[PDB]
């Protein structure tokens, strides 16, 4: 396991990784230092002899240079102590082992790598400075960040080893996953949160902008569209610009909820020949979902043409979002005084349930669930009731939040957070929970020695009745920590043993493999499958679909 | 070119919705009993009210003189005549769907760069409105 | 002259607060953007350490050095070690000052900014002395030694802009802005119940006239009358800062013109 | 009714309408005879294996009977005529992409289908009354013989 | 502002971590699981300081 | 350590040129001009210059990545005009612009008193 | 030889799969850069992965995949009458 | 003088906390931005907690409002607050270690804490007070 | 360790004023935020770097010196 | 529960059942008690499955636990993964475990 | 170095769940300061 | 680090001139993205930032011990006293352009602190150099021009590509290659093989016609002698002696 199913390996490289919007979702930023001892060695021929002869020339201390030179016979020479005798007069057949240039495949790895997208194909881009460089649509399929990763670097050696490395791993290869028949890659971050603001009804841009804004997309053809609104002033509407992104010919509908032709809240999507009717463009169109646009796109058009609706994309959400600006504060997370009102006596209503049921119980008159002991019922009742309470608080305090509110702009384009992260901080913590259950009684028929035995009040099994905003209690603090030391345990256990399993996983079924007779067979030859999944499909081209024979009425079948 | 459509409503209602800078109107045309319009305005620029008439009007193109990504679009120029001149408010779209309504009620869907309009009417007046690009003049 | 406008409302040595009246946006920014980044100063660069016996380090004295700002009234009279003949450094193109600090007293000795001595030809030029800008005399605080510590070191100032390292920057904070009333509309007013109770007016609304509470947007309005308020380091007039931002501004567009000229010919 | 399944029929039929440019007012000049005839033989050229024995072609058969259900439904002569107002060249397109789409949807051979299901399956564990989870996906893989809570679902 | 607390070994400094254990000289009282003839077990580790 | 030079952002370096001006094939009478070493100051300044020009109709900037000091002009005329002469116009309307501004701030700063 | 099947009786698809498509590029990629005679014509081109797909994309390259079976038996399939449509 | 008492974990079995003077100990509007406080309306309190705030550690008190953020985020930081370079000993130039790091400007919090006193972190602090603008300005 | 020469967002020169700064709190018993305005530091960015600087040099200067002359 | 049944029209519409839940597994007996749906009872435990249907029923129990593992937690993967994964357990006649104990007694070369 | 000197250990057959914060462990260890690795819950700081 | 779990590495840096700035002409030292607020619920960090802002603006050190009276509300009333947003929302400008920016960013002191994690101390690459004397293959350690370590989990996500042949050339080429010689009669590693006087010979099979070379991993000759000291017989063969 150590030496033989792994080991180092030579021509590699480590370093912490950087986000760069500005390159292209297959690059990868390699820096200076790393692409002066990395090398590749290229053999000399009628169409590289110039080339070749001047990397030789300029050495090994000078990118692109070079640092060894191999002649037929097998024998090596070390470019430095080798100018005494002047540059070298290069033949046909041998290797110059010189610097990875901008444009040689590079396989660019994130561990653990649990899965085959965390290994793919880069085209290289020497830049300045010592951190790796990529696009940030590939961070989800890496499962990476930039507060402290490092990712490995690998270089082929050979034409073969080169051909195959983006001919069957290069990332836009990757784009629409076999997991889950759906993209494993999708806009975004900043890029979510942007293409949501740009294209709401009342984005309109002005034509100095929109000039730039046309000239920061590579393959714009030159022509600019007409404004949406001619007179009296000349304005463009952010769904038009975000249009000239797309590629021409690409349809795509989505119904939400209350979407019509006409939608009064410009959900859903509508898209004709590669223009946007209506519908705010969000993580339902433009994420890793199914049936999205990156979907369709790179099934319509092919994996090179989404690759680049990546990329453009980002450059024209990114450049609007740069004048346009995104911030967040304390005031994001602060209700106004009647939510707050009706938020104190929703969950003043709450603990007077929790009440009502406690003093019923204490007099013998609750009974038990059936199948249940009568505690376990009371508290799945106190659980349910405070459960609720925290929902509908957080509903509350929801509906409050405006518009121009950033935590709920987030949420609404599904960059960050959830509805759970704005009850918590705005409305209430809620109830803390370890081992499924209310806080245990460490101490004698109580949890602190702040209360008094036998006390089944909320406030007492840890029901956390604030909010971040307005601050834990000590015994909320106390409570909230042991919930939250309970994740911690749960994610380091899981780790290691989820690891195991997956590590089994691949053991037991690594031989397998669908042969030229469509069956599915092991390294004996044995048949696991007939026709591989019973259909003899590829997981990368299934999309859900609906038979319309099977459902409805028998009169609708008829018709 | 020439008008696809020229009509007088008189505006029913306005909605702003949750927006700041676009109004969805309401409005019904002044001599037809079955043409109505929905249209979502720029109302910074253009603002309408309740009780407003309004005249709308529909052509393909906007050079006065019939001419039956087009063209590179370039701003106007000193002594630019069109049909823009005569009115107030100007947008260009697509329509994009062709409902039936009724035996005779036919209605067509507009989207000004996001800005959507919806046209009832009889089968006979809508007749010039094409699955095409067109300019929607208002002048109040 | 019937081109940009200036109205100076109130005048420093080291603050000029001015409105720019009848300008662009582009030109604006552009004007603020150079004075902070391309106005060309003099700054101590290298530093030659004989004696270092205190309790802070080579690379650390040498940073605070290079940060004291020094004269640069005749910056233009001096050269480019770059574009100089010379072997490391000449009067042409450097100004060296020496320092000697000793720890001869018993209480704790401070090595300012004034202790620092020019050892070059100025050749009658006006520049090199540290900038003393307090009420005792003294600089900025370069050090303190005990008794029987001592600081011998020598340094080379040259001229350069911060692009290059920020020590070459004449200009502090830069106040800019333009619309106080928001009439442009070209920021959203983020508020919790009315915006114009918690957003605090701007003093320069005292300038401009409100809006008048129900006319319609003007959607042919452009930004214009921005108000700018310049501070200085001390190494050149806060004067000078403007002027010759316009000055380095005005080279940079005529550099570009001799260039298409140049393209020209051939 | 939503399943998973190769060729998106949806998009090709919208392709052709936008491609063409359906009039959809005027007829079109598509025949009944050849509408049901251009579907029967094109479920013939739905081809996963290539077998020319009756053992093969049975398997052939059973591999796309799904497919061709859905084929059917969409391709129906009530719903080409109505519904979608397809020309005769439009629907010549639109079978010839079904033919290149299924043709390019099958399995490659030499895929190591095996590894992959393993990394399908497992990625999704790492994220994660009865006994749910990691708990219960290693009481799967390792047979258990004495689960933590055996139950019985009578109907 | 040095606190001490720590020793000096060949020149590296060394501090002690607490170690955590269980009292001895108390009686505790354990249930035991189904597979075993016995179902509880009061238990004492007798200690002298 | 991989730290560029800072005077890699304003000095022109060997066999490099300050302007390269290429024909555009995506329209008529459209081409691209990439300054080095130069940054938002000038593009911002240039473009917004030639936007006020009735014969130009298209006049765009970017700096296609923070990392190197140099940004793309894009600029299409109308016929008959060449695009080279209009950054010439643009080029002498700021000098002129920035010369009175000069003279303004100059005799209205003599008019102070405290500095 | 038992193992070679007649052309006649071939049952693999007649289709080039992406990993043979990744070989044969890769394969003859090497030979170009080995100073190998191209057989299609350069209108400007220096990287021998480019010259490959120059020469797949108009059938010339002299080379037959030898698909195997489970059981030993293997089918030629030359690359010129292979289809690449993936 | 009987005024404080040394309490172990078995002992606190048999004793009532009060967590403050202020209101629970007193016999018995209200600021709605104040976090709601129960009063626990006991008449028999045997002790009164020093401070709440000491019931976290060295690492923890160094954290400003800790009742503010989730429990995993002063978990991370407890951890991490430990990286920072600082001034670790002021006899740092007679000293020789295997690696040492000196931040050449120690700045002390802007926002400190009461526990921090006692820490000596405004003697020797680990971080500077940089301006911080929480913002979407270029993608990086 | 020492005051800093500049302000590090504006650079704005503030190594003068560490003197200026501890006499005016000593002997004038001014408040530190009244002291802050009365030597010029307006911009809360400059009003930091005198009111958080931590004199550490005065510790180290309590240490005899490794080399004497 | 709720289940959609067919129906007299032709439609799918859901009508509610009661359905029994229990503690503990006997499937044998519990099978041939008069009253139940012989035809649908399902146990939690795939083993009592196979021990009373078959291996090709334990397949089908295999599936479907392996199934809503995956499925509890929101998480959707392809049918043929999950299926290659159930096929590769039962293709021995026997629930073959992913352990040393089960795929690692086969005869596929010591090396591997 | 304060927290250092102020560290605690438990070496890990036993029938518990030691890693927990207990509720008798108020105002005795920091509820929030512990290692986010194998040593989670098991390394306490007083 | 802030003291609020919030840490993060150096994307890119700007100049002053071209960050975004304030009216007052204050530019940030240091700019977040506002998307690690949300999920991770960091309330005070925003409080600090509040309360740091008028700290310096009063010239006091704000009190954010836990469990006290002091409320976002207090802070908000004294920062509105200073005259600014009492939020802590200010209206910026665009550097490249000087435009205002259309939304007002939260904008203050904060206390951040540098860790010990240097990128400069991480980056290292490797081409060839110094190889382990028991296997053969590149060592460990940035420190000591090592390799970094293809693994297992890398291996079958290559597997899962397809790239035979780079898998190959990994294990082979950027690690150990080592050439033997095998008998065969017996596929023992057992063969002198005078490669001077062109000879071979397999002492034990008395031949010298029957000797084939191989490439294998170092490893694998280091591990299949290790069965031959256990007594073992890995006998490597280059034809089949069963049909499949
Ligand atoms: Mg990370
Ligand atoms: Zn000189
Ligand atoms: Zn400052
Ligand atoms: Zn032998």
Known sequence: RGNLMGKRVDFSARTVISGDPNLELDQVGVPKSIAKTLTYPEVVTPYNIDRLTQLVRNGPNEHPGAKYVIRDSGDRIDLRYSKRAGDIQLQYGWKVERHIMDNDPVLFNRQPSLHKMSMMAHRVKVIPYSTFRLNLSVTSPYNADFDGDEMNLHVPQSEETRAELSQLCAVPLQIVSPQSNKPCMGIVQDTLCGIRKLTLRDTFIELDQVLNMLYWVPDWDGVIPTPAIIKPKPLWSGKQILSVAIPNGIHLQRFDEGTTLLSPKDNGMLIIDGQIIFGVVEKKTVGSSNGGLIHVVTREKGPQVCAKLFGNIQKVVNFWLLHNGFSTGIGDTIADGPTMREITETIAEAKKKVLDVTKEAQANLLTAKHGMTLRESFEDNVVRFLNEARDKAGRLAEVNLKDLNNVKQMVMAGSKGSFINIAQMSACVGQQSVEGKRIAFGFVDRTLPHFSKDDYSPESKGFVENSYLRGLTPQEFFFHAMGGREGLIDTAVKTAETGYIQRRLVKALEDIMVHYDNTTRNSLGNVIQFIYGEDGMDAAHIEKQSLDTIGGSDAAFEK | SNTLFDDIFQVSEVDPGRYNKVCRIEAASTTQDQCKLTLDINVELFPVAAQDSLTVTIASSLNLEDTPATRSWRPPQAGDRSLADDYDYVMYGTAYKFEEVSKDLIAVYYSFGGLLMRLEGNYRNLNNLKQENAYLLIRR | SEGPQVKIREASKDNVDFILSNVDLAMANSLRRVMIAEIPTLAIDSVEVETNTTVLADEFIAHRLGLIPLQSMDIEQLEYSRDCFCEDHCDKCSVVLTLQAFGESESTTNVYSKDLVIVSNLMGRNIGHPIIQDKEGNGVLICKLRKGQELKLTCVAKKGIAKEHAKWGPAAAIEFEYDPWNKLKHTDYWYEQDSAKEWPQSKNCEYEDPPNEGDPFDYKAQADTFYMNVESVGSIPVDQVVVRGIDTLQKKVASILLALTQMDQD | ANWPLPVNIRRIIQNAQQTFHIDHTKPSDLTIKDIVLGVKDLQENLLVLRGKNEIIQNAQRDAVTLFCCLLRSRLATRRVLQEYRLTKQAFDWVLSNIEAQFLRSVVHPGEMVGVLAAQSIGEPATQMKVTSGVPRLKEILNVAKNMKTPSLTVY | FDMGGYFIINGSEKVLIAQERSAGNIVQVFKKAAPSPISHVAEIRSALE | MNAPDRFELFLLGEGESKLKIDPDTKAPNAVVITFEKEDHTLGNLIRAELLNDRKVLFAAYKVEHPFFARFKLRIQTTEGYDPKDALKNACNSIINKLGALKTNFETEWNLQTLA | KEKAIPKDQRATTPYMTKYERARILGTRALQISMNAPVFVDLEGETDPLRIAMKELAEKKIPLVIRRYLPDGSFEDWSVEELIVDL | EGLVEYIDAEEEESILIAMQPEDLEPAEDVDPAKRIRVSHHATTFTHCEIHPSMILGVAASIIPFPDHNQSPRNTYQSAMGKQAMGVFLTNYNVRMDTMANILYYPQKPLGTTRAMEYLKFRELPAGQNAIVAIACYSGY | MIVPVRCFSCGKVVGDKWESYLNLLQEDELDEGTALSRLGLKRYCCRRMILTHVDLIEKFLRYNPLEKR | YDRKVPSPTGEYVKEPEWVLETDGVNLSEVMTVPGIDPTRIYTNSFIDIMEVLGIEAGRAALYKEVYNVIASDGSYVNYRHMALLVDVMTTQGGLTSVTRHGFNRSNTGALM | ?46 | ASRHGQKGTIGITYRREDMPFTAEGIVPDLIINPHAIPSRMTVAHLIECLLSKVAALSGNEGDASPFTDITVEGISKLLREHGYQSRGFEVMYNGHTGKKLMAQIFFGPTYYQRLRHMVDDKIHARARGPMQVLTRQPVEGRSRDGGLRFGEMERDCMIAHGAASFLKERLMEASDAFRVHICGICGLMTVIAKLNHNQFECKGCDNKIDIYQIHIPYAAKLLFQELMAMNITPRLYTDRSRDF
């Open chain 11, 1 to 46: 170095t304060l927290s250092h000197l102020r560290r605690t250990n438990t070496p890990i057959g036993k029938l518990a769940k030691p890693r927990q914060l207990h509720n008798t462990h108020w105002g005795l260890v920091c509820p929030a300061e512990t290692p986010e690795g194998q040593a989670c819950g098991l390394v306490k700081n007083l």
